[PDB]
Amino acid sequence: SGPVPSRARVYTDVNTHRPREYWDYESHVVEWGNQDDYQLVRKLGRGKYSEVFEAINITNNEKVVVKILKPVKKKKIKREIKILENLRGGPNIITLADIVKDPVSRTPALVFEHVNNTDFKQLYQTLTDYDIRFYMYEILKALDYCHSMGIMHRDVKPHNVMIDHEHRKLRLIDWGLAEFYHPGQEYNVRVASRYFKGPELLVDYQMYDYSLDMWSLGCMLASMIFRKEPFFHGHDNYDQLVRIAKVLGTEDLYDYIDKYNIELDPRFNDILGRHSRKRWERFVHSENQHLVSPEALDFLDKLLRYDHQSRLTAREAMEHPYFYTVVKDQARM
Ligand SMILES: OC[C@H]1O[C@@H](n2cnc3cc(Cl)c(Cl)cc32)[C@H](O)[C@@H]1O
Ligand SMILES: OC[C@H]1O[C@@H](n2cnc3cc(Cl)c(Cl)cc32)[C@H](O)[C@@H]1O
Ligand SMILES: [Cl-]
Ligand SMILES: [Cl-]
Ligand SMILES: [Cl-]
Ligand SMILES: [Cl-]
Ligand SMILES: [Cl-]
Ligand SMILES: [Cl-]
Numbered sequence: 001s002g003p004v005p006s007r008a009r010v011y012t013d014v015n016t017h018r019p020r021e022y023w024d025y026e027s028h029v030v031e032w033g034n035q036d037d038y039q040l041v042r043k044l045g046r047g048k049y050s051e052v053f054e055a056i057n058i059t060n061n062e063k064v065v066v067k068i069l070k071p072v073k074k075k076k077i078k079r080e081i082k083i084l085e086n087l088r089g090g091p092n093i094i095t096l097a098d099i100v101k102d103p104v105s106r107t108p109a110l111v112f113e114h115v116n117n118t119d120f121k122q123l124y125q126t127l128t129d130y131d132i133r134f135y136m137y138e139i140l141k142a143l144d145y146c147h148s149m150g151i152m153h154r155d156v157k158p159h160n161v162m163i164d165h166e167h168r169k170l171r172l173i174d175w176g177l178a179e180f181y182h183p184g185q186e187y188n189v190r191v192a193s194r195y196f197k198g199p200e201l202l203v204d205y206q207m208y209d210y211s212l213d214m215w216s217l218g219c220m221l222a223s224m225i226f227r228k229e230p231f232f233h234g235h236d237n238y239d240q241l242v243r244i245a246k247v248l249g250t251e252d253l254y255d256y257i258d259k260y261n262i263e264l265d266p267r268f269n270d271i272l273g274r275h276s277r278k279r280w281e282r283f284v285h286s287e288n289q290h291l292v293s294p295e296a297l298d299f300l301d302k303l304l305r306y307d308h309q310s311r312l313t314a315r316e317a318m319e320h321p322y323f324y325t326v327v328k329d330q331a332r333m
């Protein structure tokens with residue numbers, strides 16, 4: 001007997017109701033732009049599959065950000081491009097303005113609207129209670145949008161949120177691991193950075209959905225309000241689940257496992273053993289008390305659930321009391 005089927009509780013069929021060409025990215029064809037219209041100004045950074053630069057469009061002197069892709073599975077290139085095009089005009093999602101070829105390698109170079117070169121991780125351990133709420137809400141706007149457009153981000157982490165703190169503007173970036181959701185489809189669990197991976201990934205449950213992003217989001221919130229980086233500090237994939245189990249307790253883990261009839265190695269269960277739930281209030285210390293409210297803990301508790309189907313949706317999260325006042329922000333710069 002295999003694992004129990006799952007479908008998203010929200011936006012289940014959004015891709016089903018759209019034309020094939022919306023999501024069948026394997027049959028997309030790229031309309032290239034003129035590389036010569038852009039000139040790189042300076043290097044912002046280099047990562048795994050990319051180098052990112054500041055650049056200018058010399059036709060109108062508009063400053064842009066240019067991400068030059070390093071060689072990857074060509075199917076994945078089409079995937080990211082199609083996703084970014086689909087999402088253009090979404091709230092707090094990076095805007096793909098053009099696509100050009102690298103003069104040297106002829107690899108694709110993605111041209112984006114300009115954004116300031118500061119990521120959330122650089123700021124997020126020193127925000128006020130108010131600003132955590134504010135920026136959490138802005139991230140939710142992005143996630144609800146991309147989920148509503150049938151897209152899982154699958155790499156929600158501090159390093160993937162760019163912030164312009166001066167102008168209170170935030171963009172969700174790094175859509176290279178994003179994927180279209182299709183009910184019934186089994187997905188690769190090698191997504192998301194360790195500290196942000198949901199229990200579904202860690203127990204090899206493949207029929208997951210947008211709710212993975214909500215787990216990652218919860219991991220970000222816990223980090224911010226408790227001033228702990230990362231909140232769940234696993235040393236390997238197995239220990240990531242152990243760390244989660246030492247906070248949420250094993251009782252609910254084995255209930256989740258039993259619910260979806262998941263294939264858990266008894267030798268992993270021996271190491272998991274039994275751990276008591278560690279009430280969310282246990283991670284409060286004098287350092288972080290001014291950040292931890294009953295509404296914060298209620299919210300966190302409702303995001304950080306083993307069972308992906310119990311997790312708040314992005315819309316449900318946006319309606320949570322944690323954001324009750326911050327939605328009234330008066331946009332002071
Ligand atoms: O004069 C040669 C011009 O080629 C631009 N250039 C070099 N490598 C590039 C890679 C990319 Cl993705 C782009 Cl858009 C422009 C590049 C340089 O930025 C320079 O302005
Ligand atoms: O290696 C870390 C450095 O790389 C920059 N970076 C990585 N991916 C990026 C994507 C965008 Cl859109 C921007 Cl603006 C910067 C990026 C980060 O902003 C940081 O300056
Ligand atoms: Cl597909
Ligand atoms: Cl295109
Ligand atoms: Cl990160
Ligand atoms: Cl990006
Ligand atoms: Cl996949
Ligand atoms: Cl993948």
Ligand SMILES: [Cl-]
Binds near residue numbers: 190
């Ligand atoms: Cl993995």
Ligand SMILES: [Cl-]
Binds near residue numbers: 231232243
């Ligand atoms: Cl931990």
Ligand SMILES: [Cl-]
Binds near residue numbers: 254273274275
């Ligand atoms: Cl137990």
Ligand SMILES: [Cl-]
Binds near residue numbers: 278
């Ligand atoms: Cl406790």
Ligand SMILES: [Cl-]
Binds near residue numbers: 292293294
């Ligand atoms: Cl309080």
Ligand SMILES: [Cl-]
Binds near residue numbers: 253304305306307
């Ligand atoms: Cl749970």
Ligand SMILES: [Cl-]
Binds near residue numbers: 010143144313314
């Ligand atoms: Cl959602």
Ligand SMILES: [Cl-]
Binds near residue numbers: 302312316320
């Ligand atoms: Cl709720």
